[PDB]
Amino acid sequence: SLRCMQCKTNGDCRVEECALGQDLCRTTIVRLWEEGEELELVEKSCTHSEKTNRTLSYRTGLKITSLTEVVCGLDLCNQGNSGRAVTYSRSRYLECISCGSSDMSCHQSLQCRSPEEQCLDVVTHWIQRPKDDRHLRGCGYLPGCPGSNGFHNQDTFHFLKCCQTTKCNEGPILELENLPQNGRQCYSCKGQSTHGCSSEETFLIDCRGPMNQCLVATGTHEPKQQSYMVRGCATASAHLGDAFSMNHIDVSCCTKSGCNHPDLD
Amino acid sequence: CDCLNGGTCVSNKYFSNIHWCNCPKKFGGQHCEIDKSKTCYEGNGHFYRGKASTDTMGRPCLPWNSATVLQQTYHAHRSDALQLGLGKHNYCRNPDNRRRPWCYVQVGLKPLVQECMVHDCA
Ligand SMILES: *[C@@H]1O[C@H](CO)[C@@H](O[C@@H]2O[C@H](CO[C@@H]3O[C@H](CO)[C@@H](O)[C@H](O)[C@@H]3O)[C@@H](O)[C@H](O)[C@H]2NC(C)=O)[C@H](O)[C@H]1NC(C)=O
């Protein structure tokens, strides 16, 4: 029955009554910061339970982008602004390497303003008008943290490395084709059940690097909210579905070649 | 997305819907509408998108999203805002095709039209 605040990026809000299976209202914010000046975009609405509090900030030569998202689950808890949060001050803030595909920088350095923030490497390739960046490096806290996770199939490659050590996110830009043949083979598909993930539209892909599990995942995508399957190669990918903007999701992994056959469920 | 002047639209999977714009080195604003380098207007200024924001008297302009400007005929919440160059700022514009770029100014208790100081590139 829960109610939230819906605010399209322009500032025009209204009270939203949440559709069932949506136990959290949330505030999404991007603060683009460049030379003194600053734009801020604020978006609010109800959201699905699996959603968590998260932050990601990266440096794009003279510019710093800060994405943040906060979720709560009480009437209009999505309204707040100047009651203030937790003001930090460390002697030695964690420093990470930082860059983005935007100015093809992926590099510079970044001081993480909070202690729960870690160093990030987010690879997002060929998946979902607007478009996520290919490579992103910086500070923040996201699902997979800590550790690292990955997935890849015929259409996509997703990788998140989250780590606490100094400048630990450094190293060469990670492209899929530079991962060595994992030796395992798993199936690959997307889209609707009998329409995109049929027994005869999925084929064996040769997995790469740390992606040796064979997954299948089901849930709800877009344009509306239809059922949606995914098959591919993975690591420790589970709750990590926004890397497909899939919700009400239930993943699965098995460690045997071809084990994720549609016939084998 | 509407990111002008060669800007490109970006989003992030870990952050719901939010999309914004990546603008080329010398263009600012949410949609890159702001010509961050122009220092004068061509013609009558109808297509001027610079950052001038002070009138003939040296007074600052009211922002195109001021509660006050929102009561005028030209303000930031118009369906065509973006096309007129009226946004969350106070930069001189000329949405009605007057002789030179202007903006509303708080003159006493009145939001009056005032021509800015920038001149013709001529
Ligand atoms: C994600 O971030 C949000 C916002 O920082 C967190 O939600 C806040 O949680 C506390 C919970 O403590 C409660 O305080 C209540 C006072 O309103 C009271 O019922 C009782 O003392 C209870 O212990 C709350 O005080 C904040 O006001 C919440 N924020 C808002 C605006 O609702 C949330 O927990 C964070 N992380 C998680 C796990 O979701």
Domain spans in chain A, listed from the N-terminal domain onward: 1-82, 83-179, 180-265
Residues A66, A70: Cα–Cα separation, whole Å: 13
CATH topology of domain A83-179: CD59 (2.10.60)
**CA–CA separation, A133 and A103 (whole Å):** 10
β-strand partners of A213: A234
CB A243 within 8 A of CB A124: yes
The nearest alpha carbon in chain A to B3 belongs to: A130
Residue A157: CB atoms within 10 A of its CB come to 23
Alpha-carbon span A153 to B58, nearest angstrom = 61
| CA distance linking residue B29 with residue B47, whole number of Å | 16
Q: CA A167, CA B100: separation in Å to the nearest integer?
A: 53
Q: Which residue, chain included where needed, has tokens 């877009």?
A: A222
b/e per residue, A33-63, with b = 16+ CB within 10 A? beeeeebebbbbbbbbebbbebbbbbbbeeb
Q: Are both B64 and B29 inside the same structural domain?
A: no
Q: What whole-number distance in Å separates Cα of residue A161 and Cα of residue A122?
A: 7
Clarify whether residues B7 and B55 are in a common domain. Answer: no
Preceding peptide of A180 cis, ω within 30°? no
Q: Is A71 in the pocket of ligand 1 (CB under 6 A)?
A: yes
- Which residues 33-72 of chain B have a CB within 8 Å of chain A? none
What contacts A34, CB < 8 A, 6 or more positions away?
A: A62, A63, A64, B28
DSSP per-residue string spanning chain A: --EEEEE-TTS-EEEEEPPTT--EEEEEEEEEEESS-EEEEEEEEEE-TT---EEEEEE-SSEEEEEEEEEE-STTTT---SS-------SS--EEEEEETTTT---EEEE-SSSS-EEEEEEEES----B--SEEEEEEE-TT-SEEEEEE-SS-EEEEEEE-STTTT-SS---GGGS-EEEEEEEEB-SBTTTBS-TTT-EEEEEETT--EEEEEEEE-SSS--EEEEEEEES------TTTT-BS---EEE-STTTT-STT-
- Co-location of B46 and B15 in the same domain: no
Q: Are B79 and B107 within one domain? A: yes
In this structure, which amino acid lies at residue A230?
A: V
Q: CB-based burial of residue A239 (10 Å sphere; 0-12 exposed, 13-18 middle, 19+ buried)?
A: exposed
Going by alpha carbons, the residue nearest to atom 8 of ligand 1 is A72
Cited resolution, angstroms: 2.8
Query: Cβ–Cβ of B14/A67 closer than 8 Å?
Result: yes
Q: Convert chain B into a string of H (helix), E (strand) and C (coil).
A: CCCCCCCEEEECCCCCCCEEEECCCCEECCCCCEECCCCCECCCCCCCCCCCCEECCCCECCCCCCCCHHHCCCCCCCCCHHHHCCCCCCCCECCCCCCCCEEEEEECCEEEEEEECCCECC
Among A1, A6, A29, A18, residue whose Cα is nearest residue A79: A6
Mark yes or no for CB contact B19/A142 under 8 Å.
no
Q: Which two tokens stand for residue A118?
A: 């870690």
Task: Report long-range pairs for A109-115 (Cβ below 8 Å, ≥24 apart).
Answer: A109/A59, A109/A167, A110/A57, A110/A58, A110/A59, A110/A64, A110/A138, A110/A139, A111/A139, A112/A57, A112/A139, A112/A140, A113/A57, A113/A88, A113/A139, A114/A55, A114/A88, A114/A141, A115/A88, A115/A90
Q: What is the dihedral of CA A181, A183, A185, A190, to 10 degrees?
A: -30
**Backbone region of residue B39 per phi and psi (left: phi > 0; alpha: psi in -120 to 50; beta: other values):** alpha
Total domains in the fold of chain B:
2
Tokens read off for A155: 């259409």
The domain that contains B68 carries what CATH number?
Answer: 2.40.20.10
Judge whether B16 is closer than 8 Å to chain A, CB to CB: yes
Q: Name the residue facing A69 among B11, B16, B77 (closest C-beta).
A: B16
User: ∠ CA A204-A205-A211 to the nearest 5 degrees?
Assistant: 125
Q: Which residues contact B62 (CB under 8 A, 6 or more apart)?
A: B68, B69, B90, B103, B104, B105, B106, B111
**In terms of Cα–Cα distance, which of A218, A30, A125, A114 is closest to B15?**
A30
Query: Is there a single domain that holds both residue B32 and residue B46?
Result: no
> How many other C-beta atoms lie within 10 A of the C-beta of residue B58?
7
Six token digits for residue A163: 């780590």
Query: Any idea which fold A180-265 has?
Result: CD59 (2.10.60)
* Domain that residue B82 falls in: 40-122
CATH class of A1-82: mainly beta
- Spatial distance between the Cα atoms of A56 and A64, rounded to a whole number of angstroms: 11
Structure tokens at B15: 């952050």
Residues in chain A whose C lies over 2.5 Å from the next residue's N (breaks after)? 106, 128, 237
Q: Pull the structure tokens for residue A70.
A: 């906060």
A30, A129, A244: residue with CB nearest B20: A30
Hey, CA dihedral for A34, A39, A42, A43, is it positive or negative?
negative
**Closest residue of B to A244, CA-based?**
B13
Experiment used for this model? X-ray
CA distance linking residue A151 with residue A123, whole number of Å: 10
Q: Are A134 and A124 in contact (CB under 8 A)?
A: yes
- Greatest Cα pair distance in chain B: 50
CA contacts within 13 A on the Cβ side of A138: 25
For residue A109, give Cα distances in angstroms to A84, A100, A106, A202: 28, 12, 12, 42
Co-location of B52 and B64 in the same domain? yes
- Give residue A22's Cα distance to chain centre: 19
User: Do A83-179 and A1-82 fall under one CATH topology?
Assistant: yes
Question: Are the beta carbons of B33 and B24 closer than 8 angstroms?
Answer: no
Q: What residues have CB less than 8 Å from A217, skipping those under 6 apart?
A: A229, A230, A231, A241, A244, A246, A249, A250, A251, A252
Cα distances (angstroms) measured from residue A88 to each of A66, A103, B96: 17, 31, 49
Q: Which residues contact A118 (CB under 8 A, 6 or more apart)?
A: A94, A96, A112, A139, A140, A141, A145, A146, A162, A163, A164
Question: Which class for A65: exposed (0-12), middle (13-18), buried (19 or more C-beta within 10 A)?
Answer: buried
Q: What is the CATH number of the domain that holds B16?
A: 2.10.25.10
Q: How far apart are CA A34 and CA A61, in angstroms?
A: 9
Same domain flag for B62 and B99: yes
Alpha-carbon distance of A238 to A253, in angstroms, equals 9
Report the largest interatomic distance among the alpha carbons of chain A, rounded to a whole angstrom.
Answer: 59
Separation of alpha carbons B68 and B73, rounded Å: 11
Interior CA angle at A10 toward A9 and A15, to 5°?
Answer: 75
